[PDB]
Amino acid sequence: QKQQSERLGTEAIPKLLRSLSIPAMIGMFVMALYNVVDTIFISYAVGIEGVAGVTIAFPIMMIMMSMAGALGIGGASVISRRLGERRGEEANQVFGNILTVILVLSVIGFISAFTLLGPALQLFGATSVTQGYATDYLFPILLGSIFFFFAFAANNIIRSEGNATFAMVTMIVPAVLNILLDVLFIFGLNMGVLGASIATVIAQASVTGLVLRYFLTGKSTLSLHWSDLRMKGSVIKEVCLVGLPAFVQQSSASLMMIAINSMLLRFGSDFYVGVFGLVQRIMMFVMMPMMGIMQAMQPIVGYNYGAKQYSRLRETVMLGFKVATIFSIGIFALLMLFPEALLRVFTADREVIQAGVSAMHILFCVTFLIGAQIVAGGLYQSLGKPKQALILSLSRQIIFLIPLVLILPHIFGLSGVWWAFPIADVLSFILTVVLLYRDRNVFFLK
Ligand SMILES: COc1ccc(CCN(C)CCC[C@@](C#N)(c2ccc(OC)c(OC)c2)C(C)C)cc1OC
């Protein structure tokens, strides 16, 4: 029991979404610029050698942040199921008792910096040029580690409460920084990769600072305590609980895209990695829409399961779905009428826009069914019974995917790239359908 600050606890709920969503929308989008507007730099004061350094370097940042991420979500979906179901103090407790396993690992990374770095780095596509670039990319971030975790944690918890607004600003602001901060090193000085890393730490420093305020200084939205508050909850079990399927979902993609990246180092030493790199943030970029809408329910379908207005959550979960679908068909078409002009960033051969958009064609007559397929994820995860979300993640990500690529690549062709996907996802979607008529209780309304 606590003081629900201006937790928008007030059930104003389909503008709860409206208002809740867009902030996501916003900062999500923003930082995505920083990528873009960062990397276009690394493609300058360095070439395409480092652009890949970066990209081989990438999955190892993901391996840390994944861990934090569970941690973050773990908290999110605890802390939501514990307001509404109004244990407002259990909350307080949790927040910090995460901060713990955080500050534990914020060291594990700092250690592994001075340790496991090169070891794993060299461990696959080690082009003696890019080898250093990834190294000089990766060393700082780990020094490093700390600011990094806190802030995705905080930004997850601050959603998990309600401050999508100050979220925005956990985003908007390393963002703007890390531009001018890059410019400052990268091109401004000459500390290239080596230094656009140190930029993107001095980013995560000067947030961390600010997050403390929205948890210490006029500690806003809610229960937020600092002296002995936390130690080592038996709730650590309770968050990992939740996070369990969360940090699979990364380690899944992540630990499978080390593969497809270093396997793209044996053929295309570099030419091709910064076209992995490239074709990603147009997946993610126009994933946002979806993602953002998701993160609106994150905590909405949080304080209404609790013990609260069940009646008013099926409302969410319907709308949840309802909207995502229209942006499902959306992305989809705009991902199949404009797959030309976005292959005009890819302007090369008249066979580049041939099979180069052959894949980019019916590879994605799946998109439109991805809307649900991904909403169903929050509403097993805000609702801290991620045991079916577990079940669910492993379906999409591995157990149907790889076994489908592998069962096409065992001689079936670069069609083994195609079918392997469009048809994988459908099964995940059909599965997901079943996981909801599984619970005539998320949606116990239509
Ligand atoms: C925007 O440009 C960049 C910014 C930061 C980084 C560093 C990568 N770090 C591991 C940051 C965490 C990855 C991050 C992304 N994208 C991310 C976190 C969790 C996710 O799970 C839904 C996620 O989706 C795969 C992405 C966010 C939180 C920054 C790379 C960037 O591009 C190479």
TrEMBL record:
Xref: CDD domains: MATE_MepA_like
Main localization (coarse): membrane
Pfam families to which the protein is assigned, alphabetical: MatE
Membrane topology: Multi-pass membrane protein
Cellular component terms per the entry's GO annotation: plasma membrane
Subcellular location(s) per record: Cell membrane
Alphabetized NCBIfam families for the sequence: matE (TIGR00797)
Superkingdom per UniProt: Bacteria
MF term (GO), any: xenobiotic transmembrane transporter activity
Organism: Halalkalibacterium halodurans (strain ATCC BAA-125 / DSM 18197 / FERM 7344 / JCM 9153 / C-125) (Bacillus halodurans)
TM stretches of this protein: 19-45, 51-73, 94-117, 137-158, 165-187, 193-216, 239-265, 271-296, 317-338, 358-380, 389-412, 418-437
Family classification: Belongs to the multi antimicrobial extrusion (MATE) (TC 2.A.66.1) family. MepA subfamily.
The UniProt record lists the keyword Iron: no
Protein name: Multidrug export protein MepA
Sorted UniProt keywords: Antibiotic resistance, Cell membrane, Membrane, Transmembrane, Transmembrane helix, Transport
Biological processes annotated in GO: response to antibiotic
